[PDB]
């Protein structure tokens, strides 16, 4: 929940750098992402934000 | 010349056509989406819409589903008219025709389609043929007719994607002067969707 620690203690690797997207972004429990691309073979965006 | 294969394909319950229909789709059924075919099922209609034996031509069947519905339900905020809401009642505007034409084309990425139309199907799926062309081929890019469906793909590209075809360019448009209001000035885009 709230940092106590109760969180932060979690010492698990996740969200490392993706092969093709410089940002770490890719989780390891996920498949690929949280920044552009993978799984989609394109670029990642999403309009959750920018108006189009 | 090919009259009665037009005539014949009218009733579809007349006599010979029906029997072929008994043994036809038996095989087609138990054959999944994407097939291919040496000849069209109706020779008049292919070689009507545009099909000739020539290299670079390919005609495929397609199956679809049966009835039209299959839709997701809206989230909350359903309360209302409801407007866009509903469930199994709505029918989708695209035909199980237009759907046959793509869902072909996205099989063969390379080629485009002048589109034929179905043969009938029962208890479920309808079928459809669908001729496609092939743009970078020879003999295709020869005959004046059956040219320009490949220039090479400068404007026409994924025809039937855009829509430009037979069933499409129908469906969302028919007629000309009169009743072409809130229809094709060019189309739905522009003159906001009806």
């Amino acid at each position: 929940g709230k940092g106590t620690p109760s969180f932060g203690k979690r010492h698990n690797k996740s969200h490392t750098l993706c092969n093709r997207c410089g940002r770490r972004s890719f989780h390891v429990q996920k498949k690929t992402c949280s920044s552009c691309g993978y799984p989609a073979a394109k670029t990642r965006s999403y309009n959750w934000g920018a108006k189009a | 010349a090919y009259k009665y294969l037009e005539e014949l394909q009218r009733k579809k319950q007349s006599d010979v056509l029906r029997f072929l229909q008994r043994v036809r789709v038996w095989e087609y059924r138990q054959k999944n989406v994407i097939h291919r075919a040496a000849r069209p099922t109706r020779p008049d209609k292919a070689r009507r819409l545009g099909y000739k034996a020539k290299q670079g031509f390919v005609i495929y069947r397609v199956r679809v589903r049966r009835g039209n519905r299959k839709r997701p339900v809206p989230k909350g905020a359903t309360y209302g008219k409801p407007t866009n809401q509903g469930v199994n009642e709505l029918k989708y505007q695209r035909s199980l025709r237009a759907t046959a034409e793509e869902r072909v084309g996205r099989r063969a990425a390379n080629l485009r389609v002048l589109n034929s139309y179905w043969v009938n199907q029962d208890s479920t799926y309808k079928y459809f043929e669908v001729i496609l062309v092939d743009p970078q081929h020879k003999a295709i890019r020869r005959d004046a007719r059956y040219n320009w469906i490949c220039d090479p793909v400068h404007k026409h590209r994924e025809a039937r994607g855009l829509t430009a075809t037979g069933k499409k360019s129908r469906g969302i448009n028919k007629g000309h002067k009169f009743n072409n209001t809130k229809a094709g000035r060019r189309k739905t885009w522009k003159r906001q969707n009806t």
Binding site: - | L17, L20, R24, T41, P43
Partner: protein
Amino acid sequence: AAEKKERLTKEAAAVAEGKSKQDASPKPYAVKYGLNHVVALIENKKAKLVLIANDVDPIELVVFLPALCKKMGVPYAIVKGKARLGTLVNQKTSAVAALTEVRAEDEAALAKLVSTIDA
């Protein structure tokens, strides 16, 4: 329809029989090609016999050959193998279709054979 016996199918493809004399009549005079031209001959009764392949595709091009043969009164036969009657007419490719307008030379075996069918 009626069933041909692989014995009749010899002799004249154009006739009820299978192709043989059918090669005659091309060397002699008269024949047709495919379904299209053959159909015309029945329409304007010119062909003595015309043949039809059994195989056929779902072509159903040859669907109205019978009834539209039996009005005109043109006898027509069934052959097995589109290729077989394809080959007798000088055609590299096979044809479901038919023939012999004039039936030259074999105005003999032809017409004798027709009698066999519809005996």
